[PDB]
Amino acid sequence: STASALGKLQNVVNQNAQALNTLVKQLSSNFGAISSVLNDILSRLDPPEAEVQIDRLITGRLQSLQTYVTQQLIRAAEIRASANLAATKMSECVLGQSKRVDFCGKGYHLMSFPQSAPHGVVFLHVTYVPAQEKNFTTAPAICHDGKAHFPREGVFVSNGTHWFVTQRNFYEPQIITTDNTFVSGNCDVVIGIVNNT
């Protein structure tokens, strides 16, 4: 339904067409000579000054052609940079799972699929986005029997009355056991430790 989502490829095509059009239209300029067509100059006067007129035409057309070529070189360099980036993206986000944040997609990357387009490529990135947050009270460690317990993976939370351990990215409370925690030191130096069992 929505159009104008492919602005970049369209811009590339338009720039190339515009450059070609201006180059071909430059052929209709006098550059100070008596005419813009070489056959009439040849057919209207003797050599000794035909050389003068042709020199004017030649220098003008050379300048135009050189300008065109230089612009083309600059544009090609830019396109090559973009293509290198695309190759890296397809190597990293399609043949594997990427950890560098926001490189491909917004969220936590899962996978990607490529599709072809007339002068480029389109990636579809699949990402995981959390939602429906909730708020809890938390502590850094638990003091029990004069020892300090920390969680292996997860974090301590409480709903107001009891304490649990959860993984960081999904609410899933569990009873605090000696298997999901480890011990180090005594509850004296940790700021914010709480009493529990």
Partner: protein, 133 residues
């Protein structure tokens, strides 16, 4: 009167919306009549920080987004002695005394074309076998 100059034909409002048509110096205009205003950088919220409170998600969503990248452009070729002389012996003889300004251009264009082919090949040819579902 704006820091970017002077503007006639549009009305200045005190609101602030998303930018449609950039004008400059932090202001832009849009169609409603035509109105000019100051850009809004986004919404405004204050996350509720505290030293013993945490927020944990309870659900998730799966999202799909696009990314578009150009990889190549058209390969073009131009001939000097036809472009600037158009099959004239006298023009060719006069151009001859400029050295080589036409070997160079052809070399440049050919290099560009070969580069385009290499670009496409390295982007897409990433596998050794053609797998089938």
């Amino acid at each position: 009167q704006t820091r970017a100059g002077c503007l006639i034909g549009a009305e200045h409002v005190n609101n602030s919306y998303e930018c449609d048509i950039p004008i400059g110096a932090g202001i832009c205009a849009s169609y409603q009549s035509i109105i000019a205003y100051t850009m809004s950088l986004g919404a405004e919220n204050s996350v509720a920080y505290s030293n013993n409170s945490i927020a944990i998600p309870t659900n998730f969503t799966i999202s799909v987004t696009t990314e578009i990248l150009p990889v190549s452009m058209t390969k073009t070729s131009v001939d000097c002695t036809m472009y600037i002389c158009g099959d004239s012996t006298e023009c060719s003889n006069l151009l001859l005394q400029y050295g080589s300004f036409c070997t160079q251009l052809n070399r440049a264009l050919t290099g560009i074309a070969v580069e385009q082919d290499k670009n496409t090949q390295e982007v897409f040819a990433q596998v050794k076998q053609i797998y089938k579902t």
